[PDB]
Structure 1
Amino acid sequence: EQAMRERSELARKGIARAKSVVALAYAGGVLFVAENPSRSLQKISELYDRVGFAAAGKFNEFDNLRRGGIQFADTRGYAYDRRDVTGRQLANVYAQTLGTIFTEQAKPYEVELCVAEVAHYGETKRPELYRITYDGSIADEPHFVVMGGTTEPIANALKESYAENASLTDALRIAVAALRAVASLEVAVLDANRPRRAFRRITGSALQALL
């Protein structure tokens, strides 16, 4: 209707007004880099043992989702096995939730999520990345994902500067570069070489060296 395009605009605008975020998969695993001035409010987080989460947009809204995600994940793992929790599954859940909100609530969530999964310790498997958008539409890119602010300048910057399997420190530079289009950064990685919890946040002196 106009009831549906109007909403799609409100949302798409609010997202285009937020800080940008990037997720890319390096040889080591998935890397999250988002521009973030605040030192207490976070756009990147761990949802489960091998799956992480990054979002752009209105905080109170995407944080709320992050919690619900964790809620859901922890619950499945308990009711089944820990290995039931998958990027695939969580994304699916976020899609159905954003989809519902966009349809039935007063205002659509002005957010854009990325759920990233990495292979379990022993095995080999190509990192998966999912982008869920304000309307419940769910995409799955293979190399990188860009969210919030003005995406094209950054998506193009990566398209050309992107080498798969880049060491950590390499992929880190490519990302910060593509974002240009340092204590203002939130960085974290989904380490596929960790035994159980893959999420690990890079901060301070450690981050400076890779930087």
Structure 2
Amino acid sequence: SPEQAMRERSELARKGIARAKSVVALAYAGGVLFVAENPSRSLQKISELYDRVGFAAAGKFNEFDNLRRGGIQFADTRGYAYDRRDVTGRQLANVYAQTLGTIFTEQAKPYEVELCVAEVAHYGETKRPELYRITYDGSIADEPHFVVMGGTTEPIANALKESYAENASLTDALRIAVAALRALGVASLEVAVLDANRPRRAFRRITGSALQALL
């Protein structure tokens, strides 16, 4: 019965995402902020995709890193084939929407991954940050304020629901995100931003002593 096999695939993928750490992404004054609970120093769950497009994920490392690599590949091939300002967060989200659907229906085991693609405006430009969440189903949800991925998402999503404030500075959004994530020091946090003020490459990690000062 494919009706029942699909059900065990969906449950298996859901259990895998739940059996993982939690990541949050939220909009703040200077762009978008990614805050993930990550103990390792080599393995990362937040990445630059293109000049203004960032990427966070939660699930199985090897698989969402497979998607990370595929997305980088895609974005660069487009940017070179057409131009840099033509690649948008929307295209990227759509490609991961269709690849996760194809994987979910055609491969032996569905990928146990949850994706968030983020985009900010270009330099000297004005536009609201866009957040998209792509699930293992391949569904793409347009989020206005914040995305929470992996683990138990309810308490973090609610804490953010009470604490969120548009146009919060970098330090306030970091406090809100760490607080809601707790519902951890610089040795257990992966923090990066999509700083809308940078001229070209917006993604920028916040680690070590600078991170120490911010939190």
Tell me the TM-score normalised to structure 2 length.
Answer: 0.97
Aligned to 1:54: 56
Distance 1:172 1:119 in 2: 21
**Moved >2 Å (runs of 4+):** none
Q: CA deviation at 1:3?
A: 1.5
- Superimposed CA distance per residue, residues 17-55 of structure 1 (whole angstroms, 9 cap, x where no aligned partner): 100000001011100000000000000000000000000
Aligned to 1:176: 178
Q: CA deviation at 1:123?
A: 0.9
Unaligned runs of 5+ in 2: none
More displaced stretch, 80-89 vs 195-204: 80-89
Q: CA deviation at 1:56?
A: 0.4
Distance 1:150 1:157 in 2: 12
- Superimposed CA distance per residue, residues 49-84 of structure 1 (whole angstroms, 9 cap, x where no aligned partner): 000000001000000000000000000001111111
Residue 19 of structure 1: which of 12, 18, 21 is its match?
21
Residue 47 of structure 1 aligns to a residue whose secondary structure is strand
- Superimposed CA distance per residue, residues 178-208 of structure 1 (whole angstroms, 9 cap, x where no aligned partner): 0001310000000100000000000001001
Unaligned runs of 5+ in 1: none
Q: CA deviation at 1:106?
A: 0.3
Aligned to 1:108: 110
Q: CA deviation at 1:122?
A: 1.8
Residue 157 of structure 2 aligns to a residue whose secondary structure is helix
More displaced stretch, 185-194 vs 79-88: 79-88
Q: CA deviation at 1:148?
A: 0.1
Distance 2:137 2:103 in 1: 8
Distance 1:121 1:5 in 2: 45
Residue 5 of structure 2 aligns to a residue whose secondary structure is coil
* Coordinate RMSD, CA, aligned: 0.5
